[PDB]
Amino acid sequence: MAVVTMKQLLDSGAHFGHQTRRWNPKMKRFIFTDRNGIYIIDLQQTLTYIDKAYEFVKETVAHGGTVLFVGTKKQAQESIAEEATRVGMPYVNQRWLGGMLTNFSTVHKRLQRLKELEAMEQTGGFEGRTKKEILMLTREKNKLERSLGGIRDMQKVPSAVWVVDTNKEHIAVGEARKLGIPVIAILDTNCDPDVVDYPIPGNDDAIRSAALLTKVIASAVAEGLQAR
RNA sequence: GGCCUGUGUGCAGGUGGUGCAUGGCUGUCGUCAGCUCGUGUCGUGAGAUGUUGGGUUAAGUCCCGCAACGAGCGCAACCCUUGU
Numbered sequence: 001m002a003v004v005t006m007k008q009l010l011d012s013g014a015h016f017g018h019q020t021r022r023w024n025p026k027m028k029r030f031i032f033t034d035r036n037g038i039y040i041i042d043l044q045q046t047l048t049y050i051d052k053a054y055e056f057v058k059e060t061v062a063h064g065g066t067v068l069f070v071g072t073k074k075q076a077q078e079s080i081a082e083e084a085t086r087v088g089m090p091y092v093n094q095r096w097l098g099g100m101l102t103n104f105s106t107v108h109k110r111l112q113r114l115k116e117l118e119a120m121e122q123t124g125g126f127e128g129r130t131k132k133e134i135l136m137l138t139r140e141k142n143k144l145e146r147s148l149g150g151i152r153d154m155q156k157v158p159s160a161v162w163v164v165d166t167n168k169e170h171i172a173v174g175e176a177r178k179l180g181i182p183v184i185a186i187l188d189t190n191c192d193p194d195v196v197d198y199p200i201p202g203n204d205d206a207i208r209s210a211a212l213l214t215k216v217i218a219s220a221v222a223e224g225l226q227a228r
Numbered sequence: 229g230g231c232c233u234g235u236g237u238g239c240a241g242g243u244g245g246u247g248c249a250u251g252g253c254u255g256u257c258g259u260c261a262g263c264u265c266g267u268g269u270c271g272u273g274a275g276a277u278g279u280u281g282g283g284u285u286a287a288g289u290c291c292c293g294c295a296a297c298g299a300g301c302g303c304a305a306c307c308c309u310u311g312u
Contacts, residue, residue: 106267
């Protein structure tokens, strides 16, 4: 099953990898040809793995599951956040707090405090406290809001995790593999293929490629959720 | 029965000993800013992380970074006096 054409991936800059000094040697089965110090990824393998990943995510969300959108690099932050908000899944955009999946019982209390803070703001009580403590509450609210945005709606813990640039986000993929959750990720030439259960070859550093692939998986989630 | 006088019987009474058996109270490092815990992670383990780095402060005071996220006893505040 395919959604985006080989030519769309070609002019989207999806086959451009990193240099020949940083490649993970396990990606010799993805890398297709070397041209001018850039490793070029195999598009046929890309679409075979895209078929596999699409089937997996569709099955998961059609059974009633959640897909975590994880992105920290500036190229993927805005795109991932926008598409996750538009479809209705939890997302991570700014920074991954260590121990959010494997330690949810603790970080969920921070979400409870976010509920409490927003609820006490909605009551409108401002001048009933110290005018310094109110400011401290406001920056505390800003911190929690900028830290936890999709996990705010997430609650009942994820079913699969979709991550961009595994190499940057090693903490998330490690926690997911520790919990036994399958990992869906985009892989550049410097990302280990063995630590991703459902890999999609791709370029992580380009905003065009990031947006295209992550919106592909968002569309998959949308169709599967509609299939519920 | 209240009451003491007696003879005894228990017994009282010990500023007698051990602060190297103790409780309680107090000095001291020092009113110095530090000391820890929960869950998570790393290590076979003792343990480490957090509490490290940059900046700032009277201060582990606070901000920004970070496999950590929080919390407690401390700092500050609430109390009295003095200045309008």
